[PDB]
Amino acid sequence: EMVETVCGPVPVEQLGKTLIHEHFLFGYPGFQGDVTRGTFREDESLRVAVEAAEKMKRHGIQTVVDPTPNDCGRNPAFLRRVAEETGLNIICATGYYYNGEGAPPYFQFRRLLGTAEDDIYDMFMAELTEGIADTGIKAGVIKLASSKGRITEYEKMFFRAAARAQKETGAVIITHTQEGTMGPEQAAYLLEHGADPKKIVIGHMCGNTDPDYHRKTLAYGVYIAFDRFGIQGMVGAPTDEERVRTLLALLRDGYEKQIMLSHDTVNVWLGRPFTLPEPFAEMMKNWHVEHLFVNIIPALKNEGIRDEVLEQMFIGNPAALFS
């Protein structure tokens, strides 16, 4: 039925072609202290963000899920301005990053007060059923993240909170996996606490190339995402070549009703402008919102995937996920 976007509630029928994981705004926790050399280009950032939405709208996309966590400069009103100008639908999130690239100390401190997991739940409920700050916007998904090879104590507080929240709300859960680890464990641990696998998207699965690992995850009946198309050389991540050679294994075996695709782009960066060093800067030349529809998809056809199947992924699956 209905899904909360930044422009208030929307019928899931009208979601349409959907990218599951892209950032308009993103900054690594700590960017706020580099304000002096990295002040936020308020009205140019908006100009770039609308550039990316119009760039997405023209390949038939009607909906983006933006899972930018609360500590990476999530900005729902900004996003609201973008949708108001483009008509694109934008679903935002409620969540923190993970230990390795998040902001532990604050909730670490409350953990000592004994109230952290309640506070995270209370925050999740608030942002899902009341609205984010005074923006009036509710998050449409819960963002979760785990570390490499571990779901830390701190992360588990959020997983628990997240599972208990979803039971109270029916919110979709979207997750981050670190370097192709902890897919199954994530699914397992959320299902243990009463989350519903049909309302769960294990993310960054494209970060493992052994399809055995994906199947172990799909077996929970959760959705999985290859949401990092375009990112190469970094994090130890595999090439777009590996992804497709890993993606195709799961398509012929008819799992497409559990797979969705994205790029995990950052269209505007918070903090100090930077430019990638020259080894790095050519491997990730393809990391942009165009990448899938002009490259990844044609490649998929040449290896024989029905356009019907893809529609399950970009339209059916997301419509399914949110209902």
Is 204 part of any known ligand binding site? yes
Residue appearing with tokens 């029916």: 170
- Contact string 278-317 vs a copy of itself (x = CB under 8 A): ----------------------------------------
Rounded Cα distance between 53 and 265, Å, is 12
Is 264 part of any known ligand binding site? yes
Stretch that binds a copy of itself, among 25-33, 191-199, 283-291, 298-306 (CB under 8 A): 25-33
**Counting contacts by CB under 5 A, is residue 176 touching Mn ion?**
yes
76: partner contacted, choices Fe ion, a copy of itself, Mn ion, none (Cβ within 5-8 A by kind): none
In whole angstroms, how close is the CB of 168 to Fe ion at the nearest point?
A: 25
In whole angstroms, how close is the CB of 207 to a copy of itself at the nearest point?
A: 17
Q: Do the Cβ atoms of 261 and 229 come closer than 8 Å?
A: yes
Stretch that binds a copy of itself, among 15-23, 48-56, 109-117, 198-206 (CB under 8 A): 109-117
In whole angstroms, how close is the CB of 264 to Fe ion at the nearest point?
A: 4
**Counting contacts by CB under 8 A, is residue 97 touching a copy of itself?**
yes
Which of positions 243-272 make contact with Fe ion (CB under 5 A)? Answer: 264
Q: Which of 4, 22, 66, 71 binds a copy of itself (CB under 8 A)?
A: 71
**Counting contacts by CB under 8 A, is residue 134 touching a copy of itself?**
yes
Q: Which of 37, 42, 302, 307 binds a copy of itself (CB under 8 A)?
A: 37
**Counting contacts by CB under 8 A, is residue 35 touching a copy of itself?**
yes
Q: Which of 13, 113, 212, 308 binds a copy of itself (CB under 8 A)?
A: 113
Measured from the CB atom, the residue of 110 and 216 that comes closer to a copy of itself is 110
Measured from the CB atom, the residue of 132 and 218 that comes closer to a copy of itself is 132
Q: Residue 39 burial (CB < 10 Å; 0-12/13-18/19+)?
A: exposed
Phi-psi region of 269 (alpha: psi -120 to 50; beta: other; left: phi over 0): beta
37: partner contacted, choices Mn ion, Fe ion, a copy of itself, none (Cβ within 5-8 A by kind): a copy of itself
Q: Which residues bind a copy of itself (CB under 8 A)?
A: 27-37, 39, 69-71, 74, 96-97, 100-110, 113-115, 119, 122-123, 126-127, 130-134, 271-272, 274-277
What are the binding residues for Zn(2+)?
21, 23, 143, 176, 204, 264
Q: Which residues bind Mn ion (CB under 5 A)?
A: 176
